[PDB]
Amino acid sequence: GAMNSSNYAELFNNDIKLFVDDTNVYRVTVHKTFEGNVATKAINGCIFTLNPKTGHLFLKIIHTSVWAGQKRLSQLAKWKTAEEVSALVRSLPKEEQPKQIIVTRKAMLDPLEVHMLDFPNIAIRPTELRLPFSAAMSIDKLSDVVMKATEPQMVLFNIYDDWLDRISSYTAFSRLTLLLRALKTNEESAKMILLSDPTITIKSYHLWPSFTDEQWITIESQMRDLILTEYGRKYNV
């Protein structure tokens, strides 16, 4: 069934599983036409597919060309997400195929289920958690590789950099989700917190700064204070 706070530590057992978030697959800007009507212009997009135990991220870039001459795009996006996830699974050797796939939006269950009918033993599941994967395009290096792409292209990353050398997947996944929660709620401040110190850099093969353990504690606390502030401002508490 659904993933929620009750069964949260299942993400970190040894059963292979993948989160799928389709929020950035179909991305548009909105603008006025010469005659004063509204039109959209699509920009490049991506399927965020992530194994929360190991940090392996399968960033499938969705080139604007996909949309060309297609109707009901936001609906198609769910089918193209599910088509590309199917293809990824099929591309994986048998022992690397996931036993479960957790979609972060329920609208994807039917498209994914239909596309996985060749894999009856891979369970497609919703979640009740309110995960922040939509803010993945706030991570400068993912946003850069998506925008620049000139064709469909899969790009591989480890979203945890090298953290697992020193902390657990549970802790890794809580840091990632806290970071992304902060970036979602107030990108400008969240990004500020990460880079205010010119001396802590981002390895070319990483996404996030090379913080020491102590510095991560200070960072994590700065992100927590960001998130709480923004809440009282939202609601007047």
Binding site: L76, W79, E113, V114, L117
Partner: protein, 300 residues
Amino acid sequence: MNTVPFTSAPIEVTIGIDQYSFNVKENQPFHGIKDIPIGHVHVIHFQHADNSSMRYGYWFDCRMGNFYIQYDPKDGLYKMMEERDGAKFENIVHNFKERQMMVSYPKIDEDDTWYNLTEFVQMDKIRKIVRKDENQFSYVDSSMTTVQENELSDPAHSLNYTVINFKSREAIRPGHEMEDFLDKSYYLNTVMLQGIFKNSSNYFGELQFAFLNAMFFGNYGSSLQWHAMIELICSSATVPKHMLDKLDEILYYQIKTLPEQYSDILLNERVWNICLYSSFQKNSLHNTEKIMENKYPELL
């Protein structure tokens, strides 16, 4: 005109034949049902005064032989049987009519209800859904399960309806995933109409038999089958014009004939709101839509 004699009525039971029914008291001299219109299937069914659970009954057709009802006190229920001795049978029947202990199938001549509910039902097909081929008639009750229900236990007692499942390889061609799931014309026309049912009359016949079992026995898996078979037509963008018009007639009499008080379990809110208002065929059920709204506007 044909007759179904009853040996006796030892226990207080409500007897139904088609859409009609009669209360019969413990050891009341009741000895059959006469004047049954030849030319359609029929069903006789039972509900014991003491067990308002398990409605049961026998689908039959009098062209296929002489049938009668006899209470079995070991198994506890009214059993349909066949009398093979033609002469011995007309003798029992003519003597009970003489004694006038039989009820007359009470058909109004203005009324085509039974015909419309059973237009496409054929006994040869019923006996493939209810396999028990030492009998020419067929038993159904409240508790019997379908082949699809069984898959998710005793197969001798199963309702072998055609399995319909919208999220199956059968329903969905590789490469046409989104296409075939939003527009089921492929599944309806090639897989089911041409492939399995051969023609629309067998399809409509199963649809109607499923409805009828839901209605007369509250057989839940039957209701699921009827809903699934409507849903596949209304979710097909391409349907023969003749099927659509007929479907609108078929459903109209099914809704007309349903007891008003049962509309909560026998009618699936989602399916009907989709079919009548969201599907490709919204605009093609004008009579089914008008009757649903003026009779069950709540469910919608």
